[PDB]
Amino acid sequence: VEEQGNKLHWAALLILMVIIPTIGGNTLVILAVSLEKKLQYATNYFLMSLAVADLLVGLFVMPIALLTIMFEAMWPLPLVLCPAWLFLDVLFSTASIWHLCAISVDRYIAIKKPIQANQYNSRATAFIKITVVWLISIGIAIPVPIKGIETNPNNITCVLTKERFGDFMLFGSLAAFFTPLAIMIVTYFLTIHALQKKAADLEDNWETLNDNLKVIEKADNAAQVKDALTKMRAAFRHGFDILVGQIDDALKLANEGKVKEAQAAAEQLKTTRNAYIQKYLQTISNEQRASKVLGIVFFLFLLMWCPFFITNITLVLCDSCNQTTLQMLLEIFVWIGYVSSGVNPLVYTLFNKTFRDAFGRYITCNYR
Numbered sequence: 001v002e003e004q005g006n007k008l009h010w011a012a013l014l015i016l017m018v019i020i021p022t023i024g025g026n027t028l029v030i031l032a033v034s035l036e037k038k039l040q041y042a043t044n045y046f047l048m049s050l051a052v053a054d055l056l057v058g059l060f061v062m063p064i065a066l067l068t069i070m071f072e073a074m075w076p077l078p079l080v081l082c083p084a085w086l087f088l089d090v091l092f093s094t095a096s097i098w099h100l101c102a103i104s105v106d107r108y109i110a111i112k113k114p115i116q117a118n119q120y121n122s123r124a125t126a127f128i129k130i131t132v133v134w135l136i137s138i139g140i141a142i143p144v145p146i147k148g149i150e151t152n153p154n155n156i157t158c159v160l161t162k163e164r165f166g167d168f169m170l171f172g173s174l175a176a177f178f179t180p181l182a183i184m185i186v187t188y189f190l191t192i193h194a195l196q197k198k199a200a201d202l203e204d205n206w207e208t209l210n211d212n213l214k215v216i217e218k219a220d221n222a223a224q225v226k227d228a229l230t231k232m233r234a235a236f237r238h239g240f241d242i243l244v245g246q247i248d249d250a251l252k253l254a255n256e257g258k259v260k261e262a263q264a265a266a267e268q269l270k271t272t273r274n275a276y277i278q279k280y281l282q283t284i285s286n287e288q289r290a291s292k293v294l295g296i297v298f299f300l301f302l303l304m305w306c307p308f309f310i311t312n313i314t315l316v317l318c319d320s321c322n323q324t325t326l327q328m329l330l331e332i333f334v335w336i337g338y339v340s341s342g343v344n345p346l347v348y349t350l351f352n353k354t355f356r357d358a359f360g361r362y363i364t365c366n367y368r
């Protein structure tokens with residue numbers, strides 16, 4: 001008879017490359033938001049909340065998960081801690097995916113509606129959005145402790161069983177991964193359409209005011225400006241006004257009869273328009289550059305969680321598949337997601353200069 005051997009080396013490899021990078025990676029993100037006041041704004045409370053969720057995985061979920069790998073199938077801890085550990089696993093892992101969904105949506109509405117709210121009014125919006133995400137995560141994770149594990153059986157095997165959590169494995173998976181994925185996919189195309197439209201209207205304005213100064217440049221009479229300059233009447237909230245009244249000021253010279261004086265005044269908007277739309281051009285450029293980074297990073301997160309959730313629902317639907325050689329894959333695919341959830345806030349914040357500069361001095365134990 002050939003029995004299974006030791007697997008301590010795998011657990012050791014997990015500590016080095018999963019647990020330690022998870023706890024440490026999320027600790028840096030939390031510290032950066034907590035210490036550096038330059039990062040203490042509403043948007044980064046999604047990242048801090050997310051970092052906390054993933055931190056608790058590496059602290060209370062991942063270490064105990066080693067015992068399943070390192071020790072026998074029997075639950076070594078007290079029986080009461082079995083559904084709790086199962087609950088915390090589902091809770092925090094779901095919180096990670098739904099946080100990104102929240103961020104994916106929140107980043108989209110920031111593009112469609114640039115002036116969403118003030119600094120104060122958006123600060124409370126964060127807490128509400130964070131709370132909802134956590135409340136969603138609880139409702140998805142709470143079928144586990146309510147149902148419980150199978151209890152003359154003295155000991156217990158702390159594991160989600162297909163014969164019991166069949167509905168939960170299938171539905172929970174849909175509600176925890178495939179549902180936010182569906183949203184992040186929709187908001188993706190919504191974001192792509194938003195950016196290409198936001199720049200389409202800018203190119204429209206940049207071409208319609210240039211066409212109305214060319215007719216202002218080559219002007220024979222003030223009557224030629226009496227209809228052409230009026231077309232520019234409707235084209236930092238002070239931004240739109242500094243050129244509106246400026247264009248209206250030129251019309252005052254047109255009605256007065258000063259044509260040549262108005263043409264030279266129209267050339268004064270050359271340093272006004274260029275310094276304004278180019279400032280709004282990099283606004284879109286940075287908005288497009290930040291969304292592309294968010295897209296790829298969030299994609300890799302979901303992609304690494306894919307092998308688990310696709311296999312998890314397969315364990316339920318496919319009744320023809322080998323149960324033994326399918327749940328053994330789950331025992332590996334979970335850690336792939338654990339790697340994903342662990343380094344998710346870190347990697348995303350490595351593209352931010354302030355976050356990255358903060359991490360550099362926190363490793364050197366500076367803390368300002």
Ligand SMILES: CC(C)CCC[C@@H](C)[C@H]1CC[C@H]2[C@@H]3CC=C4C[C@@H](O)CC[C@]4(C)[C@H]3CC[C@]12C
Nearest residue numbers: 015019020023024025027028063362363364365
């Ligand atoms: C629990 C088991 C796996 C062992 C403990 C893991 C150790 C190696 C991990 C977990 C948390 C990690 C720490 C998290 C926070 C910081 C602050 C940072 O400025 C320097 C690195 C440092 C100090 C990390 C070093 C490595 C660390 C201590």
Ligand SMILES: CCN(CC)C(=O)N[C@H]1C=C2c3cccc4[nH]cc(c34)C[C@H]2N(C)C1
Nearest residue numbers: 089090093094159160168169172173176334
């Ligand atoms: C570590 C505990 N054990 C040993 C039994 C596991 O097998 N845990 C897996 C189950 C999970 C799960 C199942 C169903 C719906 C779900 N929504 C969110 C999650 C989830 C998280 C997911 N975690 C990450 C891995």
